Amino acid sequence: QQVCTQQAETHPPLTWQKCTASGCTPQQGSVVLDANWRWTHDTKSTTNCYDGNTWSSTLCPDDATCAKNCCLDGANYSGTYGVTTSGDALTLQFVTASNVGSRLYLMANDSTYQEFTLSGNEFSFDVDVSQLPCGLNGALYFVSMDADGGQSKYPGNAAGAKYGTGYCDSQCPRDLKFINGQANVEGWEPSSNNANTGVGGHGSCCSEMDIWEANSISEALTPHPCETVGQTMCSGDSCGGTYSNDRYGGTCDPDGCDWNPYRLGNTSFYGPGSSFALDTTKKLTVVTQFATDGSISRYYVQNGVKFQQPNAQVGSYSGNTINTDYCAAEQTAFGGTSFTDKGGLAQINKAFQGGMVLVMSLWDDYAVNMLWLDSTYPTNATASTPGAKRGSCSTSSGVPAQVEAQSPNSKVIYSNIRFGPIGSTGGN
Numbered sequence: 001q002q003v004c005t006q007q008a009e010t011h012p013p014l015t016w017q018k019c020t021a022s023g024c025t026p027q028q029g030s031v032v033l034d035a036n037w038r039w040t041h042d043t044k045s046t047t048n049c050y051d052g053n054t055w056s057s058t059l060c061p062d063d064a065t066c067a068k069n070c071c072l073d074g075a076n077y078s079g080t081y082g083v084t085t086s087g088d089a090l091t092l093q094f095v096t097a098s099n100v101g102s103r104l105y106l107m108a109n110d111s112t113y114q115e116f117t118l119s120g121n122e123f124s125f126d127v128d129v130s131q132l133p134c135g136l137n138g139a140l141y142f143v144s145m146d147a148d149g150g151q152s153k154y155p156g157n158a159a160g161a162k163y164g165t166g167y168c169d170s171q172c173p174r175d176l177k178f179i180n181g182q183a184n185v186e187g188w189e190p191s192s193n194n195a196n197t198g199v200g201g202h203g204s205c206c207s208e209m210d211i212w213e214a215n216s217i218s219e220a221l222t223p224h225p226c227e228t229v230g231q232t233m234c235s236g237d238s239c240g241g242t243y244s245n246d247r248y249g250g251t252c253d254p255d256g257c258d259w260n261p262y263r264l265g266n267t268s269f270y271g272p273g274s275s276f277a278l279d280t281t282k283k284l285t286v287v288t289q290f291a292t293d294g295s296i297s298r299y300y301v302q303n304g305v306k307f308q309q310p311n312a313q314v315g316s317y318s319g320n321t322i323n324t325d326y327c328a329a330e331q332t333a334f335g336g337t338s339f340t341d342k343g344g345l346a347q348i349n350k351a352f353q354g355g356m357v358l359v360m361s362l363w364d365d366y367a368v369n370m371l372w373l374d375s376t377y378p379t380n381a382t383a384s385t386p387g388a389k390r391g392s393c394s395t396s397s398g399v400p401a402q403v404e405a406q407s408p409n410s411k412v413i414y415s416n417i418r419f420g421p422i423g424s425t426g427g428n
């Protein structure tokens with residue numbers, strides 16, 4: 001995709017902390033909006049290359065020609081997309097006039113994403129999920145994205161990280177408008193329940209580490225392994241993911257190894273009100289520790305009180321950390337084998353040892369209604385079915401067009417981001 005300047009591109013500044021054994025030091029940073037939310041149009045005019053959920057027939061005949069004829073434009077972060085930063089805080093608004101949701105990446109500079117090496121290090125952040133009802137997701141995660149957005153590998157990309165290009169995940173999303181310096185007009189199917197999205201022929205795969213998938217009702221910690229650690233282009237049903245005839249035909253794991261305190265047995269640990277150990281009406285600190293083995297440790301901090309991850313009994317397993325033993329026990333108890341099929345913890349440990357881009361987003365589910373996070377899932381399973389109940393929300397809740405009209409002023413606030421070796425983020 002090319003670059004147009006019908007509107008200037010200014011990344012909202014966000015400060016984070018880099019920690020070491022002797023202290024934590026402030027770092028200058030900024031966030032960039034994903035390329036899919038941007039206005040794609042002709043390089044020489046105001047003619048849309050993509051309007052609604054249908055591509056331009058004259059400007060985008062094929063994938064390669066479209067990228068030559070079309071440009072990405074600057075984004076009004078506050079006015080159009082409702083994204084504001086104030087020192088430590090990054091605030092994302094669910095609904096803005098003519099817009100829903102957002103996805104942003106932390107940057108080292110304007111030209112490059114900020115790459116994190118999780119192996120041997122820990123990640124800490126404060127989050128406000130009080131305004132996040134059922135059907136929404138305040139997501140904070142890491143993905144194996146190219147630091148430059150793929151400008152080095154693909155010459156068709158002239159935008160780069162400066163305009164939020166080159167997104168990848170384990171779902172291998174085919175909904176991306178631009179992949180590898182090429183458009184996705186070929187084989188593009190408009191969405192039936194979304195007047196702004198669609199499904200193309202190609203997709204984008206990379207290792208995904210979901211540190212935070214949460215609302216006021218439930219929170220989940222999920223590692224996703226891919227056969228290819230870095231970014232690769234997928235083709236058709238081969239990529240897999242939620243939107244394909246086959247979900248487990250890709251090179252990646254869509255399901256993942258997930259740790260949901262509610263799903264594992266504890267229904268009074270995370271929720272709204274004094275009753276829960278972690279009151280979601282109030283903000284909390286979430287610390288995620290990554291060992292060199294790939295094992296994932298976790299503790300929370302709310303109002304000065306440290307909460308260890310609650311011990312869960314899954315089959316023969318007993319503990320509070322994500323490891324091969326738990327991930328195998330969860331697969332046997334609840335069902336599915338997708339995590340270990342793509343290499344498991346040993347495969348995604350390669351992603352921890354490599355660079356991954358920090359992603360902070362707010363979105364609703366147009367496919368499942370977020371029932372996989374905060375409700376009983378799937379529909380074909382009963383409340384009695386092991387690992388079916390993941391939250392306390394209704395099976396009717398989460399409908400995108402319902403929650404957009406009901407709670408348009410929903411928001412998630414990410415603040416106090418710290419990164420450093422294990423045991424360094426807490427104080428000094």
Ligand SMILES: *[C@@H]1O[C@H](CO)[C@@H](O)[C@H](O)[C@H]1NC(C)=O
Binds near residue numbers: 108109111112
């Ligand atoms: C931007 O970021 C990368 C990694 O921090 C750095 O190596 C590079 O020098 C920076 N480029 C600039 C500041 O122009």
Ligand SMILES: *[C@@H]1O[C@H](CO)[C@@H](O)[C@H](O)[C@H]1NC(C)=O
Binds near residue numbers: 265266267268269307
């Ligand atoms: C779940 O929540 C908290 C975690 O600290 C704990 O006090 C409580 O005993 C747990 N309940 C269970 C395991 O049933």
Ligand SMILES: *[C@@H]1O[C@H](CO)[C@@H](O)[C@H](O)[C@H]1NC(C)=O
Binds near residue numbers: 378380381
């Ligand atoms: C249950 O639902 C899933 C879709 O999420 C489907 O693939 C599966 O075949 C269904 N049937 C059974 C018997 O579990």
